[PDB]
Amino acid sequence: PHGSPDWLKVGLTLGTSVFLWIYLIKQHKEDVLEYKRRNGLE
Amino acid sequence: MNPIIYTTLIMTVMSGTMLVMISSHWLLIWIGFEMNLLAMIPVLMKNFNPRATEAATKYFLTQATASMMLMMAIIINLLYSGQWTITKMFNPVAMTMMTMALAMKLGLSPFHFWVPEVTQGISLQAGLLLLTWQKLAPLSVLCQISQSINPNLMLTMAMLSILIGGWGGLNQTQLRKIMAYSSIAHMGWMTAVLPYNTTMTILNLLIYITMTLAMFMLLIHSSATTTLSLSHTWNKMPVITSLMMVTLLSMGGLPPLSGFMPKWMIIQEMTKNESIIMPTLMAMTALLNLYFYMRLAYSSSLTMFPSTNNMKMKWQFEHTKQMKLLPTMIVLSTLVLPMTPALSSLN
Amino acid sequence: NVLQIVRDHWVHILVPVGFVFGCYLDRRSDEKLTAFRNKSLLFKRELRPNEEVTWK
Amino acid sequence: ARQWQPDVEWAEQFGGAVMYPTKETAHWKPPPWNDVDPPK
Amino acid sequence: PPEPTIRLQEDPDPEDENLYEKNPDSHGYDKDPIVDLWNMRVVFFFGFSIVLVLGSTFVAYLPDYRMQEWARREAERLVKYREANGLPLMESNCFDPNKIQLPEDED
Amino acid sequence: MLKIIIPTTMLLPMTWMSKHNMIWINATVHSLLISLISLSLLNQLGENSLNFSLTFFSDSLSAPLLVLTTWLLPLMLMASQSHLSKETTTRKKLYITMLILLQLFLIMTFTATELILFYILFEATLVPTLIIITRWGNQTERLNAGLYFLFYTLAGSLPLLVALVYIQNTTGSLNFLIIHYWSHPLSNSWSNIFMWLACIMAFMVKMPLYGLHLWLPKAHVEAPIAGSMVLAAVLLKLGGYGMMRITTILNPLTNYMAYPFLMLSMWGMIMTSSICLRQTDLKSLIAYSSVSHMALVIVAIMIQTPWSFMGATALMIAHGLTSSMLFCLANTNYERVHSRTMILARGLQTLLPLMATWWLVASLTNLALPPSINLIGELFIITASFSWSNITIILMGMNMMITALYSLYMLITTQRGKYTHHINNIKPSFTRENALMALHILPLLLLTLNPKMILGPLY
Amino acid sequence: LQYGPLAFVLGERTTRKLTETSKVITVDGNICSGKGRLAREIAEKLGLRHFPEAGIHYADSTTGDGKPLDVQLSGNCSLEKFYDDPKSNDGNSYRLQSWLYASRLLQYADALEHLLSTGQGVVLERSIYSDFVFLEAMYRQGFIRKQCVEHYNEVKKVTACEYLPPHVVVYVDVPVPEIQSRIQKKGNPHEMKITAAYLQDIENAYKKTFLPEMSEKCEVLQYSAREAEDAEKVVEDIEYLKCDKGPWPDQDDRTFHRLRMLVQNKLEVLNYTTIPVYLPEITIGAHQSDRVFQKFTELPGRKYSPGYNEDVGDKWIWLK
Amino acid sequence: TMMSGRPGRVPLQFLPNEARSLPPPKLTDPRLVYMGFLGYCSGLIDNAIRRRPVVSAGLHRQLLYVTSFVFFGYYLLKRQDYMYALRDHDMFAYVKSHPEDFPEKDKKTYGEILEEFHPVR
Amino acid sequence: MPLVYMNIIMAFAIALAGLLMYRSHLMSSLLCLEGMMLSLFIMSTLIILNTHFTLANMMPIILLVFAACEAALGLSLLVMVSNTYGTDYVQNLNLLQC
Ligand SMILES: CCCCCCCCCCCCCCCCCC(=O)OC[C@H](COP(=O)([O-])OCC(O)COP(=O)([O-])OC[C@@H](COC(=O)CCCCCCCCCCCCCCCCC)OC(=O)CCCCCCCCCCCCCCCCC)OC(=O)CCCCCCCCCCCCCCCCC
Ligand SMILES: CCCCCCCCCCCCCCCCC[C@@H](O)O[C@H](CO[C@H](O)CCCCCCCCCCCCCCC)COP(=O)(O)OCC[N+](C)(C)C
Ligand SMILES: CCCCCCCCCCCCCCCCC[C@@H](O)O[C@H](CO[C@H](O)CCCCCCCCCCCCCCC)COP(=O)(O)OCC[N+](C)(C)C
Ligand SMILES: CCCCCCCCCCCCCCCCC[C@@H](O)O[C@H](CO[C@H](O)CCCCCCCCCCCCCCC)COP(=O)(O)OCC[N+](C)(C)C
Ligand SMILES: Nc1ncnc2c1ncn2[C@@H]1O[C@H](COP(=O)(O)OP(=O)(O)O)[C@@H](O)[C@H]1O
């Protein structure tokens, strides 16, 4: 109809994407360190 | 009906299925099937008209008969071994009664006759639920006791289902009957691999459910239940017809589409067991399904049919309700062939 | 005019960038098939005084 | 000069209750547009 | 018969358009003269000038990776050796018989 | 091999983000550049192959087909520019998308180190062609044609798939290299006979074999010009490539199993050549001529000698170019007359002389005039067949005579005689059409200078 | 929060909004009668909302901008041609009748939506009911075929079986000769060509098929030309009578929720106006359909959804 | 290979602890890139169905689709790799513990094996 | 396996066959289902009491309860179908055809 960009929904969407990406990066780093520690690489 | 009542009934259907899939006692599995049957009827009869009432009555009769046969098999198996746990059947007569009951619940041939009838009687949303969610519980029970099934009987019913779906879909102008016969053929494809690999059964179920969800949501969006009604869709929303055509190509098993993944894998699995003739007949029979999918694709997007004058008014309006999961369903039912080895996730 | 034809002729650059990316990907995929480098019976060779790998 | 597109007589092939009409199924009538029948 | 003898409301089939009418020097590519001329120019430059000439020259001068000259030089030196040493040119056995262990029949 | 695949994929975003009046120019320029890039796969080895990775490899059988496939797309764009002028921008972009997708599938099909990957892409090519035929075809029969073109193919292709997976259960691999190095003789058994048939019939139906050739005149007559071009130039050669690849595991059973197919081909080439003599449709005539040439290619592959394979490669390339040119000439006539009947527009040499020269050159190269590569392939196959049996020379000579007859009949009917009086809409030929014909014909006469580039891996 | 099941679950019930004044009213009468003035007076006096009679471009007034669109893109019919050549070879008469019925259906859905959403009553001219009377006349004068009226009957059944009829039906009774006098005194050259037989058929099929049928499910107030001038007595008559015979007293919250989901979604309202039944007067060829649809899409604010059209002036597109 | 009853299997555990002994998929894994591409296609189709400018309608929505597809694809790839590692582990252990069923065949060269020759004529 | 169990199973088979003929009277279909559950109850009770499996003394009750609930639903459906035609004849449900 006649609507402005819903800044609430936009903020939630951007925040969800940023949180998911940050969580994925942290998970990958934890996985790499755990694999190296458990297999005696570094 | 009241939206709260509708939500409660849907959650009761889902809770019955979950009770079937989480329990280890035959009585609790029977109770889950009973709960699912009980809460399913008003959902089919949501849009009150004599057709829906007739469909609900046919569905109730078939499913109650199947439940009675299931309880009979449970009692015979208990008689020949004092066991209530879902594992082995312990009797040839109890296993045959059980396979018959689960085939009637699934709609496998020769117990397929109710599927087109009920699907034509009910609306598109009820048909979506009926053809997607109602297969999870009988197939889970079959996956649990697959090592007991006589492969001859299961393979006979699977081949019969594939043949019947292929031949019965060729004669249909109604879209809901086409969906019902497609469901019958896909059930046949699923149950032909249970004796060998239940992982392939689950993979086929997932792919079929994705394609069926996309197809039903496209049919609801362009609210057509007839071939000629679907022929008018291009003059309002051609992109919907294009997506429908690609989805029908996927449903026919044409590579490199997603629908090619199950059959391929199934064929592959069946060749590891020195089974050659049956997969060949299965593929040659699935050609019929592809043929009537192509007829629908011709009628929908590849050619432009005559329209009516009043359609111009429809050009001025947009859908009030939109489906959140339709794009994901389309992409998943069309473009996941490169991700095939992920089936080792034992989906 | 710069910053105007770019918005109009930007599409042309894509085919060449795809070619460069494909060349890089071909080299990258090549880098993982070096199990027999300088190990075949036919071309088993002694390294030069300032050579590390016989091919890349 | 113009690509062929289906006309009314072509589209009417797909308007029956079933494909491939026969003598036994000739009397069959397509279902109502809304899935509601007269109560008589 | 009150019917109009008309099956439906349809556009009449149009007559095909001539590109030479609104534009002599039309090159048959597009109805816009500038786009037409530049489409001609790019087709001719990238098809005849670049691919057809430079590609043909590139194929003509492709290095001898099929090893025809190498094969002829190897054969020349091999013939030179065998003629001088009295050897019977090419041999009938492709592999040395001493490194073949035949199965005894003893029948 | 990704240096060719990635630009072809980038052709799609470049097409869809192009201006409404810049799609043809950009597509043509970048397709020509991709052809130039692909031209550097002709540097082949006398050793094994160009094994780029675990997924893609190049061969001197693959490289000429790849170069032809890349070169065909710009010509198809030029040919399609005319009859799609009154079309919406979105649908023109969709047509170009279909063409690009078909090129991508063909390029990946021809490299495809795996037999299952080859099968998947070999069947993926079936979808864009079907859409092109059934969507942008003019007549009402296009739908029917599509149905034929589909089911025939699948009728042969589903058994192959079964056989394929079966082989991997016994051999353990479907990689061409391991398959070739670890090949073992195929016993003379019923199971092996049916495995042989499953392996062969999929490629046999696509050549097409004489018995199974009915889909081809339908599909070619019904398809638009670009569809006809790609069907005659590249899609028919998928069967030949597949047979040459797969016959390595079918020995020695090929000696016995080849007899029915050899007889079908040697008699059906005569049959289809004679059919061409009584044909009222240009496109149908060119389609039947294609059937005859592919019958000769089938004979070559079944004989399975070095000269047979060299001749088959040369003939496949030469026929692709020649048949594409012939379809383009017929389409230039059709876009003026709108009839597609040979007897209608007559005496066109008096009205369009340069196009008459193009017609003459195309007819001469279809006629296998030496030293064209058409005759190089023809002669190599004929010599191999003569060594196979000296009585084949009768059928080969009859085929040559009938081929000359219908080629010159098609030339004389359309170009010679008196012009039809009531046809007054015949305009001078456009620069686009003349350039299209030249870009078809100059590569053939250049290839006759370096024949070893198209003689395959047994050269 | 657009209306739906969630709003109904949380607080939204339409029975609390009804204050015995909703009472949807529909005024009728002949072609040239003072039904519009009487309807407007009723709407002003009762405090209800007036809906001017639906025309060729009624749907144009509720979509995009309210400005009407071109005739070839909206309706593809004209009343002036129907008056000039009622027996035209292109089937303008039945195309006009069907488009007008679809407009009536859209306007009735809009009125029902307004009443069920706000509780305020509405006043209408000719509704989906009594729209057939013109059709009947067109059949008896020979302007349309019997297949046309059969297709009209099918569409009318499958569409009008879904709505609640008006509480009050108001009819203005004016005889044919004085209507004709009004027509000549009007001055419209196309309006001049109406015969007396056409008006007589309209009135006869009007008070011989529409009055008894609404008498059994609605409350009808017949008025003459003289006694329709004074709206005070009409308002008094409307207020005095109480509706307890129709379907309205049997409605409740869940039936109202169903109807409110129905009256929204104008696409689902108009679903059966384009049923695949091929009458030459209304079926349109594939080529013309494609051309006209492409022309409609190229309209300024019609390529995308209402809020996503840059040329009209919609901003912030990339964040919506 | 039915591993449903494999001993020491926690019932509803998506990724067991021992799966942490395996190298995680790289963030630039081609399969992760394909999952992101699938999310992008879903965003484009979402824009197209709702009649919005397909390429540039909602950037937040397309970003969310891509991100969610990448997230689920990463975890799915981990589970896939773990299951294949279990299959190989079990197969090698079974071959080790059953030496009589997988014998060491004698090494024979082609110079001492007689293969039938079939001339092509 | 005694003769009593076979007699009960044959009663179950007869009830199922009766449900399968469909002469008329969907009412009779519901009767056949109820006879089937009666035979099920009897035979399960006999098996459970014979083996002294104390806890499964629950399940006949349970079975009974659930079956009767089903019957109620079925009866309701019957009424509505009859409410359309005035009779419960099986052959009246011929509107939907395969
Ligand atoms: C092999 C794998 C590799 C390739 C992958 C291929 C798949 C990828 C994409 C998958 C799907 C996603 C997109 C589909 C959404 C559809 C949207 C659409 O309609 O298009 C309009 C839209 C523009 O038009 P618009 O003004 O916005 O609105 C017009 C309306 O949308 C509607 O317009 P309209 O109403 O005016 O016209 C109506 C039209 C509209 O109907 C359609 O447009 C059809 C849409 C396609 C169906 C999608 C199905 C789902 C996926 C199937 C994939 C199949 C592949 C398998 C092989 C089988 C081949 C079929 O329908 C018809 O005309 C009916 C007749 C059609 C003939 C029969 C139908 C055949 C369709 C088959 C198409 C298959 C390929 C599609 C490619 C994408 C096309 C946009 O097109 C686009 O711009 C989208 C294209 C993608 C944008 C790319 C942006 C990236 C560029 C910059 C980055 C550079 C990259 C590299 C980075 C580094 C560089 C430095
Ligand atoms: C068809 C395309 C894919 C669609 C799938 C739906 C996508 C959305 C699902 C979102 C994530 C769901 C995962 C649930 C979180 C934890 C699940 C965990 O607790 O359960 C595990 C189970 O994990 C799941 O089974 C794996 C789900 C992964 C499904 C994807 C594979 C599809 C095949 C590849 C096609 C490409 C699709 C990729 C794009 C989506 C353990 O199950 P277990 O109690 O031990 O055994 C019971 C099942 N048995 C009997 C079959 C063995
Ligand atoms: C109008 C009349 C003409 C006017 C002009 C008069 C002059 C005419 C003279 C030209 C024709 C006469 C023939 C004379 C031939 C001379 C050139 C020839 O000798 O070169 C050939 C070379 O030609 C090329 O090999 C063949 C052309 C390449 C073909 C590629 C096609 C272009 C790509 C476009 C895509 C097409 C797709 C086709 C699918 C495969 C053979 O060379 P070669 O003896 O070996 O060794 C070269 C030198 N070395 C020793 C250093 C290596
Ligand atoms: C239709 C358009 C073209 C389609 C493609 C046509 C090409 C397919 C033709 C198939 C090739 C031949 C099939 C089998 C060839 C083997 C030779 C055998 O048939 O002949 C004799 C076999 O004798 C008899 O022929 C037995 C078979 C008789 C039954 C076959 C039906 C005959 C006509 C049917 C033709 C229909 C073909 C199409 C079916 C849809 C040999 O005697 P014998 O030494 O004992 O057998 C040696 C082989 N062994 C060792 C494996 C046992
Ligand atoms: N269903 C219909 N069919 C044909 N014409 C109609 C229809 N409805 C309204 N009209 C035309 O609309 C015009 C205005 O309607 P009318 O009530 O007669 O005038 P007024 O606006 O003064 O009340 C009239 O010429 C009438 O014929």
From Swiss-Prot, chain B:
It is a multi-pass membrane protein. It is found in: Mitochondrion inner membrane. It comes from the Eukaryota. Keywords: Electron transport, Membrane, Mitochondrion, Mitochondrion inner membrane, NAD, Respiratory chain, Translocase, Transmembrane, Transmembrane helix, Transport, Ubiquinone. GO terms for biological process: mitochondrial electron transport, NADH to ubiquinone; mitochondrial respiratory chain complex I assembly; reactive oxygen species metabolic process. The keyword Ribosomal protein does not apply. GO terms for cellular component: mitochondrial inner membrane; respiratory chain complex I. It catalyses: a ubiquinone + NADH + 5 H(+)(in) = a ubiquinol + NAD(+) + 4 H(+)(out). It holds the Pfam family Proton_antipo_M. Its EC number is 7.1.1.2. One of its GO terms (molecular function) is NADH dehydrogenase (ubiquinone) activity. The keyword Ubl conjugation does not apply. The chain crosses the membrane at residues 3-23, 25-45, 59-79, 89-109, 149-169, 178-198, 200-220, 237-257, 274-294, 325-345. Belongs to the complex I subunit 2 family. Core subunit of the mitochondrial membrane respiratory chain NADH dehydrogenase (Complex I) which catalyzes electron transfer from NADH through the respiratory chain, using ubiquinone as an electron acceptor. Essential for the catalytic activity and assembly of complex I. Core subunit of respiratory chain NADH dehydrogenase (Complex I) which is composed of 45 different subunits. Interacts with TMEM242. This is NADH-ubiquinone oxidoreductase chain 2. The gene is MT-ND2.
From Swiss-Prot, chain I:
One of its GO terms (molecular function) is NADH dehydrogenase (ubiquinone) activity. The keyword rRNA processing does not apply. It comes from the Eukaryota. It is found in: Mitochondrion inner membrane. It catalyses: a ubiquinone + NADH + 5 H(+)(in) = a ubiquinol + NAD(+) + 4 H(+)(out). Keywords: Electron transport, Membrane, Mitochondrion, Mitochondrion inner membrane, NAD, Respiratory chain, Translocase, Transmembrane, Transmembrane helix, Transport, Ubiquinone. Core subunit of respiratory chain NADH dehydrogenase (Complex I) which is composed of 45 different subunits. This is NADH-ubiquinone oxidoreductase chain 4L. The lineage of its organism: Eukaryota, Metazoa, Chordata, Craniata, Vertebrata. The gene is MT-ND4L.
